Design a protein around this ligand. Structure first.
Ligand SMILES: Nc1nc2c(ncn2[C@@H]2O[C@H](COP(=O)(O)OP(=O)(O)O)[C@@H](O)[C@H]2O)c(=O)[nH]1
Length: 301
């Protein structure tokens, strides 16, 4: 199983570095950027410089830069069963280069999943608009596109929170989407899913969203699953309208087979009977009494 994770532009590079620091098991990390100094400071193993004033923040340099290096991108990606593309949309490199990265992955026939953010509203109308044109182009070359509007992450951390901390939160959610999907394959627990099942729920489906919950104690299965369903990242989504649902139960060695059934029944309660629902587990030996449920609805709208 060969899974590659590609951070594109500055924000995406910070995200995959965060995934590298905290470890996602069984995947290869790449950083793609035009800024050579950015890639030198990055702690990711594989880095791919693409491309030949106030012209870096323009998506078209990013697109042209990646069009000029398709063969370099193609060589990094080939041989992969699943590619994840991480980017903060809104800039010049991520917004322009990520859809080229995607098209290259999908023209090689790889299951291609985008996980990207929309900028905070304080970043200005211009970056909000850039981000939306870039997501539109991205959605044409990806099997699933998971969007994270950064403003939802204020819904749990308000305050006069640090700009450092706001973007650390976006790093964390990007990592949770990637790890929620990937480690169902690379780190299965008692109930393993097939790669075919993962393929069926993500493939040629369009818009997706992610939600997560964690819980402890005798009822952790029900409360973790219901916390995921009511995650603010899923607020405006009618889970009964999603054509696909992927569910990752992550626990330690103490996962009970009746807890898996309880997460399953609770998710299937809110899911349409005409959807593809896939419930799998992941084994994290250092989780002791905590149970994580991550829900990915695909094929929405
Ligand atoms: N996850 C994450 N997102 C970021 C970070 N910094 C910026 N962003 C978001 O990414 C968007 C694009 O910025 P950036 O990646 O630096 O521009 P680019 O390199 O031209 O694509 C910004 O509008 C921010 O909303 C970061 O450190 N981590």
């Amino acid at each position: 199983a060969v899974i590659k994770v590609i951070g594109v532009g500055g924000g995406g590079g910070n995200a995959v570095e965060h995934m590298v620091r905290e470890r996602i098991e069984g995947v290869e990390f790449f950083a793609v950027n035009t800024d050579a100094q950015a890639l030198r400071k990055t702690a990711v193993g594989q880095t791919i410089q693409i491309g030949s004033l106030g012209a870096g923040a323009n998506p078209e340099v990013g697109r042209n830069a990646a069009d000029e290096d398709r063969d370099a991108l193609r060589a990094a990606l080939e041989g992969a069963d699943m590619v994840f593309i991480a980017a903060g949309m809104g800039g010049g490199t991520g917004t322009g280069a990520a859809p080229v990265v995607a098209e290259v992955a999908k023209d090689l026939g790889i299951l291609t999943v985008a996980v990207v953010t929309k900028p905070f509203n304080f970043e200005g109308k211009k970056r909000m608009a850039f981000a939306e044109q870039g997501i539109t182009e991205l959605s044409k070359h990806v099997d699933s596109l998971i969007t994270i509007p950064n403003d939802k992450l204020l819904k749990v951390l308000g305050r006069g929170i640090s700009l450092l901390d706001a973007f650390g939160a976006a790093n964390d959610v990007l990592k949770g989407a990637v790890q929620g999907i990937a480690e169902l394959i690379t780190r299965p627990g008692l109930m393993n899913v097939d790669f075919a099942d993962v393929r069926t729920v993500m493939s040629e489906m369009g818009y997706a969203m992610m939600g997560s919950g964690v819980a402890s104690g005798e009822d952790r299965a029900e409360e973790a699953a219901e916390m995921a369903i009511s995650s603010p990242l899923l607020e405006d989504i009618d889970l009964s309208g999603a054509r696909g649902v992927l569910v990752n139960i992550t626990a330690g060695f103490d996962l009970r087979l009746d807890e898996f059934e309880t997460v399953g029944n609770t998710i299937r309660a809110f899911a349409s009977d005409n959807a593809t629902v896939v419930i799998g587990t992941s084994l994290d030996p250092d989780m002791n009494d905590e149970l994580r449920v991550t829900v990915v609805a695909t094929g929405i709208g």
